[PDB]
Paper text:
In previous work, we have investigated the binding preferences of a [name] domain that is known to interact with the C-terminus of the cystic fibrosis transmembrane conductance regulator ([name]). The [name] ([name]) controls the apical membrane half-life of [name] and is a validated therapeutic target for the disease cystic fibrosis. We have previously described a peptide array-based approach that enabled us to design a selective inhibitor for the [name] [name] (CALP) domain. The result was [name], a decameric peptide with sequence ANSRWPTSII.
Each substituted lysine was capped with an acetyl group, to more closely mimic the electrostatic character that would be present following modification with an organic acid (here: acetic acid). Substitution of an acetylated lysine at the P−3 and P−5 positions yielded binding constants weaker by ∼8-fold and ∼24-fold, respectively. The structures of CALP bound to each of the substituted peptides were determined by X-ray crystallography, for comparison with the structure in complex with [name]. The refined structures reveal similar peptide conformations in the binding cleft. Indeed, alignment of the structures of our acetylated complexes reveals different stereochemical environments for each substituted position. For example, a P−4 acetylated lysine interacts with the CALP α2 helix, whereas a P−1 or P−3 acetylated lysine faces the opposite side of the peptide binding cleft, and a P−5 acetylated lysine can access either side of the interaction pocket. The other three sites are negative, and S−1 and S−3 are more negative than S−5.
Residue numbers in the entry:
A (entry chain C): 1 to 10
B (entry chain A): 284 to 370
């Protein structure tokens, strides 16, 4: 399945 | 657009106040996806949603994987210089 782009908080 | 050198002043007790996406394993730059209101990136100005982060404190982030970029970015302290561009 397609996935949302990994996002990180910094 | 033009590559900019942008200064951010961060206290040792807080994070940068940015969300990022991308990196080498995605075939795109480290990109700013959010600038968090009332946190250092917001207060210091110069950093905007959609900017690619090319380097921090002289450390090249152009060919860096996402996780390793998170490590490098999160490890910086104090007066932190970003090299960024909007394309």
């Amino acid at each position: 399945a397609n996935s949302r782009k990994p996002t990180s908080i910094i | 657009g033009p590559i900019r050198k942008v200064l951010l002043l961060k206290e040792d007790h807080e994070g940068l106040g940015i969300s990022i996406t991308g990196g080498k394993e995605h075939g795109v730059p480290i990109l700013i996806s959010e600038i968090h209101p009332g946190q250092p990136a917001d207060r210091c100005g110069g950093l905007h949603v959609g900017d690619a982060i090319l380097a921090v404190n002289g450390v090249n982030l152009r060919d860096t994987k996402h996780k390793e970029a998170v490590t490098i970015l999160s490890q910086q302290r104090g007066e932190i210089e970003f090299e960024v561009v909007y394309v």
